[PDB]
Amino acid sequence: RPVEWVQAVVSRFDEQLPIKTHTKVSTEHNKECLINISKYKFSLVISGLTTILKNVNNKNLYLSQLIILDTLEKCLAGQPETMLVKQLLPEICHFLQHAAELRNSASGVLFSLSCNNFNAVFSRISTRLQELTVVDVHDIELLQYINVDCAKLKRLLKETAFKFKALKKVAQLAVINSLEKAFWNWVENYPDEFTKLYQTDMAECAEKLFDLVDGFAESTKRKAAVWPLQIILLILCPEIIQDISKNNMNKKLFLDSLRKALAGHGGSRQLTESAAIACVKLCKASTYISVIFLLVQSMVVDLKNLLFNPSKPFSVDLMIDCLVSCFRISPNQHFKICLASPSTFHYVLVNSLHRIITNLDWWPKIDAVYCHSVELRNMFGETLHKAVQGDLETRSYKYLLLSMVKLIHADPKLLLCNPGSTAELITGLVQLVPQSHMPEIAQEAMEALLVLHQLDSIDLWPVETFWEISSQMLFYICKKLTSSSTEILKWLREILICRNKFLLKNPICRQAQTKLEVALYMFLWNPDTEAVLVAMSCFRHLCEEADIRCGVPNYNTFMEFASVRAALQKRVMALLRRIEHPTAGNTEAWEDTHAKWEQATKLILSLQEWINMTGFLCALGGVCLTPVSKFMDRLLSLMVCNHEKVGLQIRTNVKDLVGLELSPALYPMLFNKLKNTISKFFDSQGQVLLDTNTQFVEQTIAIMKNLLDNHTEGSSEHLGQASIETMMLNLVRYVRVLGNMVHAIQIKTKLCQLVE
Amino acid sequence: DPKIQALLLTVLATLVKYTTDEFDQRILYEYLAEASVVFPKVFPVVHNLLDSKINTLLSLCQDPNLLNPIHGIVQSVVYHEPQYQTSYLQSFGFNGLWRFAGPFIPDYAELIVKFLDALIDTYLP
């Protein structure tokens, strides 16, 4: 019965789609199992996914389709024909901000499909070409996406050339654009095959199609449309390029027209703009390799004077393609222009450098650029300064800064290698992490700082530098955290992992460790459950740091945090009570939380945060044994909180938190303060001063009952330290003078239950 | 010996079929994932037993630890998809193994009556 269980995995995966944490893990685990099943029973899994995709097609819809298409792509990329062609391929055609993601995903699916399927996708394309000869072009666009090799490219060109004159003008246009991408698809995937082309049937197809496409070009607009393909088709004819460098006359007149259009002598802006696109594509093509270099040398200077002119800016992806190509051709005049200049040039430079890192054996590596690191650092500092001090100009500095941080994520080594310099760089990134108005930048600054904290990076900043800089970062981040906090805290966990790794290979440090300790304790009360769990995880790394240092007080309780909404807060408070030993950190965390809590209390007189802060103060406060005395007096004042909208909730939560969660080491202070307060309810003749006092007494009885019910280990030791006798006598004496009404009877009953 | 592999597998599968404790199931399915990869030619025997519960755990469950073995078994099965059907246990007399070890008379009792009477008549004078 294997088929039946494969279908059960497929059916599980379908029902777990968003359109219909554990469901995330289950979904990914199912997807990964389907992929690994597809590695063998490929058509069962693909059929199921196809069937699901049909059903789904007939925010959560897009996410479901993305999950299905990502699964399909990874299955197809793992492939060791009929329904691929008759069932899947039409659905992938149907797909061809989430629409662009879906188009990208579907294209990756189609690319993967096409590798082993090509003859079928080409048969669909060839059939629509035939239909077009006797206008709906969408199947022709599939030529953009499909995997193409040298033999397949030759076939596509041959099929096209034969039919091209019989096609309608809109179909001819769709073909022209689509073949331009199809050429690039081959060159990018199979650079070795393009290199071999420069080391006659392809050239015959390319020349035939060139002359056909030239015959189509009857107007300025059609000329501008075809020139990017005509340069490709000419690049597919190395021997024609060699002849026209000295039947070919129209190819020479085309290159001369491109030169004239780059040099500004063509009046038509559309032809100059198109000529830029064509000559960038030529420059690009040369990097994947020859006579082509002579053609590049004839146009590159005019192309640089078109795209990189600070006095007359062109009208970014095209400029990036140009700069990357120029760098690959010769690894810097236009580079210095981009370092100096319009912010759009700074943008194009940085994105070009990022592409150079992230995208062949003869291509120059990024390391030639490590002469310009000082200028890149200056550009970063300036851009940072301009983004923070900030409408259209401001928005442009944001996109630039994001790109510079992405560049730092792509490679730190550049910045560090030419060079305080490192401290400035890290400080600038660190300054972005807090910024609420730029979440995308902050996220990337964190990733950048993380890769800057990997071993190989730190060496380039060693140990005396690591300590100073990394602690300064920690101290600053923690200081902000104690003033997207959750994501910053996750990242701070991974930074601590990196610090532990760096020390395992091995005054601001004490300050940083203390502020970190403060921050982590302050996260234990945070209203976000995820934040609390992450903070717990951070104590593990604080312990690991100390193990690594010491191997050359709280540690047991930190390891218990590491081992771990209302249930979690209860568990946290139970652990906080087990902190016996004072530290600068825990003390300061208490004082800061107390200060915040007093401010929040005034504002209240957000509630769940105040409850959690209250609980934290109650649980940790023993370490501080004054500020604690004042907090306890304030809690006692809140037991009788008369506030109309939040008073019941305040009284209930103070009662429950004092009664279940207070530190055992504070019981001696609590009983003295309760005693002293209740004693004020009597005059000098020992008569009872009878609503506030009655309410205090009821809450006191419940609080004391809850304390005495509690079996927290070590609580017995502290219960002994202060006498209850005068307090309990005063409680019963107070309750005796309450009349025989229902509420007073309940209070008498509760006091009996306390006494028991 | 494939009979010993089949018996071992059938016992583990029997223990999965019935036990309600998810912690038992973690241990057992981890051993079935290795055992599937180890004894792939014999593994088909157990498939009938596993089929009902594996459908149930795939469609229902949300523990990754238990699912990791289950997905491993399905992958292993498909990867090696036979030389021994469920009938193979019947040939040597074990088709009842998963039968009997399920949850809690006449036909069995009459044979036991004859057996006990024969036990007495052989052993007791």
Curated annotation (Swiss-Prot), chain B:
Subunit structure as annotated in this protein's UniProt entry: Interacts with HTR6. Interacts with SPRED2.
Listed name of the protein: Neurofibromin
Tissue note: Detected in brain, peripheral nerve, lung, colon and muscle.
Reported disease: Neurofibromatosis 1: A disease characterized by patches of skin pigmentation (cafe-au-lait spots), Lisch nodules of the iris, tumors in the peripheral nervous system and fibromatous skin tumors. Individuals with the disorder have increased susceptibility to the development of benign and malignant tumors.
The protein's role, per its UniProt record: Stimulates the GTPase activity of Ras. NF1 shows greater affinity for Ras GAP, but lower specific activity. May be a regulator of Ras activity.
Top-rank taxon: Eukaryota
Written domain comment of the UniProt record: Binds phospholipids via its C-terminal CRAL-TRIO domain. Binds primarily glycerophospholipids with monounsaturated C18:1 and/or C16:1 fatty acid moieties and a phosphatidylethanolamine or phosphatidylcholine headgroup. Has lesser affinity for lipids containing phosphatidylserine and phosphatidylinositol.
PTM comment text: Ubiquitinated by RNF7/RBX2, leading to its degradation.
Places the protein is found: Nucleus; Nucleus, Nucleolus; Cell membrane
